[PDB]
Structures are given as structure tokens and as C-alpha cells.
């Protein structure tokens, strides 16, 4: 049985922990044995934290992850602009340029959308990674989001 | 504070790393205290768009041997601020090594460090061989050399 | 302007004076003729190949190729380079 | 495109450059300024084939990728009746040390 170490990163307040809680407990106020494409595998979701710390100890913890979920809230334009900074820090620690990655637009159950889905789709095509719109409250796209990253780690590892 | 160190300008400037050397380039960034930090390597003939900041220092070495490399026909690279968004280019090349230093690289790449003193060369070349290049000894030279 | 460089086995190499001045040892010696009693012909020719390589590629501003050194020549070439200061 | 050559005869070897579009007769004129011998008493060869005074060095087999500065090509020279092309060979390096294998 192959294990997958996934990491959820993003701006402060985008829903990193909420997505992880709902993915595991089906609850909205970390390991899960999942069958993806007929393959039994375990999802080891790492701490989401979010505090800014540029130490070698933090780099060592993030370097262990194989796939990264870059999250932004569709109602917060700043969380979308920060996606570039989060993606570059991921490439720096992983020592690679094509890291298994999936862009995630969280909080799509909200009526104050300030980021067009086409803007994220255009950004996703530029980075060569898939994009998925999710909602931790409604569990919309939450399973589609994490599974899609799992498909990227396998395709990356071939 | 060390003279050779980066400034916390926090102003981003897009840089293009171009490796036109037959070596695997190790981009080394001097932090805000003069301590070198390694970064992802560039295979030969490869180019990568880099996110950096104004006033930050960069140097380039061979990823495996830590030989010296040239950026823009110079050893140190400082990007300015992007003029109207135009990114700044960093063209990594091989330096025209001295025939002595070039021979040292070839001998080091063929003999284990334990068997250096087993070669039919003069006793001085043993010390020259085991004086492997590093960033620390070079940083001391570029520090004292930048005085005006 | 050329100079003559004679090896230990009697091979005379005619290189441009600017190219020969690349080494400090030859610069101190020069007249128009220099002899090396301890440098064989196959090693002195390679040094002249470095001379032509160094003068041509010092002014290049985009990319430089690697200077090839065979394993069978490296040790002899290293001692000659150390003696020539180049 | 520049070509880099080793004009060799007996125990003499000249390190010089030229243009791939330059003439063999022009190269003989370069040997004239170095060894003080006219082109009428010179015969330039590529290996064992005589080079005509009208063809270009490229048309003889000396291109930019065959005559790099770090690996120049070899041109034979014979002086005057002409003599047989004789190029004395360079020395040989010793047996590669057991350590470098
Ligand atoms: N409506 C809605 N609210 C959400 C969603 N995801 C998270 N939230 C809300 O956003 C807030 C932050 O959620 P949380 O998961 O803690 O965010 P985070 O990115 O982990 C914040 P930090 O980085 O500081 O730990 C909470 O008030 C939570 O209820 C979502 O999909 N929909
Ligand atoms: Mg959290």
C-alpha cells in the first residue's frame, strides 16, 4: 500500500484546516485510507499552520510533502495574488520546477466572489497544474480536489 | 554587518537564470547576514524564470565540484528593479580558467581525495589539489577586493 | 609577431607573441626564442592550444566552451602549467 | 567563422588562425612571413592530400567545427625539386596511473 504525503498551503484564512477537517471527518465547524482509481492508498495530510517562518526546520518539514494544495478564497483577491509566492517557495524547497500541484479556489459557497473562475483557470493553464473550485462548508469539490492532487503525484512519478 | 549581504528591500524583481555552461550550476544566494544559501540547480543549457528582490546578492558554482562560475562576465550578480516590468537577465558562463586550475579540476574529477598524494607530481601540487574550491574562501576575496 | 618555443625533444612551436605572454614564466624570460629542458613536445603543444583557447575566449561575452584535457595528459600538463604560471 | 590550424613540418609547428573563406595560397603567404620561404617553394597538405592554391581552407576540409581553438587541425608543409611530406611525431604520455582508473 502506497502512502501519499499531501500539504495544504495558502494565505491566512483561506480554509486550509477547514478543507482538511471536512475531507477526514465530513464536518465543518490526519490520515484517511482511500480508494482512488482502484488503488488503495493512504493520505497523510500535514499540518496547515500558515504562520510565516523561513527557517531550515520549516523547510525540512515542507520538503517532505510530495503534493501541495495551493489554496485561495474566491472572495479574497489578496489570497489569489499570493499564489505565486506560495508556488515559488514550494519549488525552492522541493528543488524542482514541476512539483505535483493543484490550484484550489475555496469558499465558493459565498456570495461575495471577487475572483473570476476564468482568472484562476487562466492561471492554472500557465502553471500546468489543474484547478478545482471547492467549498468546505458544503463539501463541494473537496473530494475532487485532494484526489486530483493524488493523480498528479502518480503522473509525476510515472 | 558583513559588506557582502543582501538588503531586505522587499521589492520583487523577476530574474531569468540562464545556464550556458557545460556544468550543473548551483545558484547560491547570500542572505541578509552574508550567509550563503543553496537553491535549486540548473542543468546545462536550461533556463528558469526566478522570483527575486532588489539588492539581493547571487553567485553561481558547480553543483558537484563548487568550481567558480561567471555571471554576466562577473562573479557577483545584483539585479536592479524591473524597469517597466522588463525582467533582468543573468547569463551564467564558464570563466576562462587558468591552465593550472583547469588541470586541478580534471585531476580532482579522476582521483579520490585519499589517493591524491599517490601521484607522481611535486609535493606542492598535493596541497593545490586538496585545496578544493568553496564559497567561503572566495567570499573572503570578493569582500576585500570590493574596497574603494 | 611570433615567438619560438622549443620542447625537450626538439620540437619548436611558433606561436604569436601575445598568445605566449599568457603565461607569466614566458613573459619574464622574454628575446624571441625560449627552450624548456623538462617539457616534452606533446605537453608543450597542448599548452599552446590553451594559449589559442585563452586569447580567443577571453573576449567572448555569451558562453564559453570547456577546455578538454585527456586523462593521459592531465598529470604532465598540470606540472607544466604550474611551472609556466598560466 | 575562424579556423585554427597547426602548420607542421618535421619538428616545427606553427599555431595560427585564418578564415574558412581564406585561400590556401593566402595561408602559404602567412608561412612566408613566419619561416621566410616563398609560396613557390611551399606545398600545403591536409594529411596526405595536396592542397590546391586556389581552393579555400573549407573546401579542403577545414571548417569551424573541425578546427576549434582548443583542438586545431593539422596542415602538412613541404619545402623545395620538392621534398616528401615528413611530420615528425610528438612525444607520448606515460602509462595512465592505476589511481586514475
Ligand atoms: N463559508 C465558508 N467558510 C469557510 C470555508 N473554509 C473556511 N471557512 C471559514 O474561514 C475561516 C478560516 O478557516 P480555517 O480553515 O481555519 O482557515 P486557515 O487557512 O486554516 C487559517 P490559518 O492559516 O490562520 O490557520 C473560518 O471562520 C471558517 O469557518 C468554506 O469553504 N466556506
Ligand atoms: Mg489552519
Author numbering:
A (entry chain D): 1 to 29, 40 to 168
B (entry chain C): 60 to 207
C (entry chain B): 17 to 46, 57 to 112
D (entry chain A): 1 to 80, 84 to 104
Show passages lifted from the paper.
Kirsten rat sarcoma viral oncogene homologue (KRAS), a key component of the pathway, is the most commonly mutated oncogene and is a key driver of tumor growth in several human cancers. KRAS cycles between an inactive guanosine diphosphate (GDP)-loaded and active guanosine triphosphate (GTP)-loaded state, acting as a molecular switch for downstream signal transduction. Proteolysis targeting chimeras (PROTACs) are heterobifunctional modalities, which recruit an E3 ligase to a protein of interest, resulting in subsequent ubiquitination and degradation of the target protein via the ubiquitin-proteasome system. Here, we address this gap through the development of heterobifunctional VHL-based PROTACs capable of engaging and degrading KRAS­(on), thus addressing a wider range of KRAS mutations.
Having identified compound 3 as a cooperative PROTAC with the lowest ternary K d and the longest ternary half-life with GCP-loaded KRAS by SPR, we sought to explore its degradation profile in cell lines exhibiting different KRAS mutations to ascertain whether greater ternary complex stability for GCP-loaded KRAS would indeed improve the degradation efficacy of the KRASG12R mutant. PROTAC 3 dose dependently degraded KRAS in the Cal-62 KRASG12R cell line with a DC50 = 462 nM at 18 h and maximal degradation of 75%, while ACBI3 and 1 had no effect. We next aimed to solve the structure of the PROTAC 3 ternary complex to try and rationalize a potential structural basis for the improved affinity toward GCP-loaded KRAS. Leveraging established cocrystallization protocols, , we crystallized ternary complexes of VCB-PROTAC-KRAS with KRASG12V-GDP and KRASG12R-GCP as representations of KRAS­(off) and -(on). We obtained suitable cocrystal ternary complex structures of 1 with KRASG12R(GCP)-VCB and 3 with both KRASG12V(GDP)-VCB and KRASG12R(GCP)-VCB at resolutions of 2.83, 2.63, and 2.89 Å, respectively. Analysis of the ternary complex structures of 1 and 3 with both KRASG12R(GCP) and KRASG12V(GDP) showed that the same relative orientation as previously solved cocrystal structures was adopted, regardless of the mutation or nucleotide. The main observed difference was the loss of interaction between 3 and Tyr112 of VHL, relative to that of PROTAC 1. Chemically, 3 differs from 1 only at the point of attachment to the VHL binder, where it presents a cyclopropyl 1,3-dicarbonyl in place of the isoxazole of 1. As expected, differences in the Switch II loop are observed between the G12V­(GDP) and G12R­(GCP) variants for each compound. Interestingly, for 3, very small differences are also observed in the base-binding loop regions between the two differentially loaded mutants.
